[model samples]
Target chain A: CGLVASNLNLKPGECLRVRGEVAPDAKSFVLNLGKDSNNLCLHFNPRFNAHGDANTIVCNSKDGGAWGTEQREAVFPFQPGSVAEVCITFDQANLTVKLPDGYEFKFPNRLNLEAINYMAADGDFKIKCVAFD
Target chain B: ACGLVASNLNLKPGECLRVRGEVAPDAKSFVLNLGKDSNNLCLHFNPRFNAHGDANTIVCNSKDGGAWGTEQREAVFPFQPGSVAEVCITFDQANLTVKLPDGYEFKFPNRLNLEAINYMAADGDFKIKCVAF
Candidate 1:
């Protein structure tokens, strides 16, 4: 059981970041974003989980506060227990997301465009590839 | 009303990120991490705030998603309507904070070490130096 999968080929002005439980079974996992900070977030993990749910996801900040609004839920939807996906979208003061249930959770776009560019998922839940149309 | 205050001269494991209505009354504001990424997150605004709240807090990522544990709340407490302050802390799978009422909030360290380096306060709050000996 690993993360669902995807490339997350995003555009300029677009943003995507995910946060969720990788698995209660694994010791740790990796999050990979292909591009640089200007375009991707690869090999990222929220160390607390690897450390013991002390950390759960991966983030890239130069400071200690790399975490954002917990009000914003990290989206990892699966294809009926097969493939998983990381989704993201942006709007006015609202950061909208399309969840597995088809409903959307909105938060303030706190990180705007300065986020992971390319992304990969590796965990107890094997991540495949994600896409946008 | 103003925000609380802090110097935030944190250690290696410590992390800090803040998000709030800088001012529903103002148009735009700024988020500044004093050092660099590695130790602090300077000038990280989710952007939608100034851009709209659309982007609120400050974040830095090269690709798409630069946001972290949305379940993790950004703390900005005011001193009985005096100064404004940002807050941050870190642990395994859990990030934490000390609020105005002397309560604590926690989250996951999604960014681990790759977070902001230094930080600064602009906009609505007047910052003060925090100390721990």
Candidate 2:
């Protein structure tokens, strides 16, 4: 259903790029950056229709499994059976996210991490590649 | 002694690893490394965009027990600031070869004779796009 990749050691001043393909009958996709799932700094979920949400992008953090307040982006750029690309860079303060649709936004880094060591992807997306630079 | 975040790749001898990224506009240098750990790199590939008294030169080296080995330099650099570049690598018991954009190849010794490397790091003035299999 989902997969996890650990020991990423992605530091500040570097960007994490994800290129993936959305499942043809997909409901949603998620990418989490953190020390672990319980200590997530960024829980990025873009919903086409899932979890009682539709056509929205949600950002949040998880501290010991307690979800933080959600930040929503109503601009939907992900299309079913199409490629989705996003670039994320972060520091202790915030994460800067840039989407393929030219939408850019910043979400607070509640985990206060210097580098993220874990990345987990879940839901209806096939991750093509992940790179840190 | 120098490093960034580490990812365990379980990279094998015959496997080809390809990474894609864009050089930052103000970058002076960047590095891609593979090893058993940060302190024992089998391949340290650096592209200097005017770093270390070199302009557009590529430096290759290895590390063992936190000690850097001999430095090898090359002249065929295809990287430019604010542009995308790709590097592919293949290695065996004797050597590791890095294939740069436009067919520039840098061959360096696998001084540690590492059959399978798990740790990988990419740092400096480049923004990563993908690490594809």
Candidate 3:
């Protein structure tokens, strides 16, 4: 019924996939993007805890030739113990993460997916199903 | 043959045994015993690493029934990578770890060996001749 800690190292700009469970009490969580600062981004209070709107997946990217990105929030609908899938496509400029639920986010790379490889729950949230393809 | 880093949580007043190599490079080693400040004990730099002072097995006991143990240095000589056989004789006050060179210590704690673990090096200096008993 709660969340713990977990981290993963991922390839840059490549497609990233995740599927997992969400405990009922997990009100907020964030996936720390990038291996270092200046390239960091966060997925704030997730909407996937209750019956309301559930936002889960997103893509980050940079605006200039260097890493300059943004956090594009989504309105994806998926609850804990439910299946959530994302297809991420991005380059040095920005990224687009589209969910199977028809929700999408377009983030530019101040720091693209190139250097981000972290995922975590912001609070005591349970993740039932998560995977990378 | 050489020793590696490992540890196990053992129960009190239990029988212990060991077997393995004496990494020629391992000139000394020790076993640290403790759970609390007052009960802490160290087996001290062992003489099992080199060929000249090959003292390996001993029993620590309290001199006052208060767990005031001693460091009984033995003259038992068991070369590394060589299987020497022996047995363990212990009680609440003390323990006698009779390792038959490469034979006894390898006595798989299948079940009775309460946390009988760890064959470490002395100060990053490899000791214990690794043996396959």
Candidate 4:
């Protein structure tokens, strides 16, 4: 139901830029980083409406086949059916995500590897491009 | 071996270019160039295995109008022959920061003074597995 771009070598201080259009009836979307589909270093989920929370972005990590604690931020800047840009900058212990309208949020790199070799995104969206630098 | 030249690309501040590749076991050196053209370079990122009486020295420079700018050198080089490394570079309007695969960061000025960059090339004895811009 989504897209995954894997085998990417994502380094610290390097940013990943994703350009896409959200589905008009989208409920949520997830952007992930890890070695593969099951072992996620970062799980960035944006929910339009989930369990009484609207416009909330949830972040988490999965290590050793177990999911970590979830963290949520209440900044929603995505518009459905419109082109949106998301930029994520990796660091030693944090992942800074910059929304298209310039809002930024930080999440801990709990799975703390030196670099992430895979990136995958899935949800109610159409990805036009995925760029890393 | 020859390298690759990608044209008509505009890289701006807050954007990064990532190169993932391998070096020949007996490699001497490799160079990554970004500019408007070969004669009008904005950045010259070179890694030498054993050059100028130095092992694992990284050199950086720029060129304008066919004349090279001041050369910058970094003593810490993390790449090795017969190994693969991922290099990521970001321009923050003032400096170009490089993230070496070994977790070292290197910076150089935005000497070329161009706001948007559009050309790039990789040269010498290296096998490029992937390039992201």
Measured by DockQ, the strongest candidate is 2
Q: Which scores higher on TM-score, 1 or 2? A: 2
lDDT for each candidate structure: 0.36, 0.83, 0.38, 0.78
**Alpha-carbon runs more than 4 Å astray in model 1:** A1-9, A12-65, A72-82, A92-94, A114-116, B1-133
User: What is the DockQ score of candidate 1, to 2 decimals?
Assistant: 0.01
> How would you encode candidate 1's per-residue C-alpha lDDT over A21-105 as one tens digit per residue?
4454554555544333233222344343344444334344222224432321354333222323445664444434444466455
Q: Residue A45 lDDT in model 2?
A: 94
List of clashing residue pairs for candidate 2: A9-B5
Interface RMSD of each: 19.0, 5.0, 15.7, 9.4
Worst 10 residues of 4 chain B by lDDT: B1-10
Off by over 4 Å in 4: B1-133
- Cα deviation at A38, candidate 1, in Å, is 9.7
Q: Find the number of clashing residue pairs for candidate 1.
A: 122
DockQ of 3: 0.03
lDDT of 1 by residue, B36-115 (tens): 33234322332223443433433332211343323222443222223333444332223323322235443323343434
In terms of lDDT, the poorest run of 10 residues in model 4 chain A is: A1-10
Best of the candidates, TM-score: 2
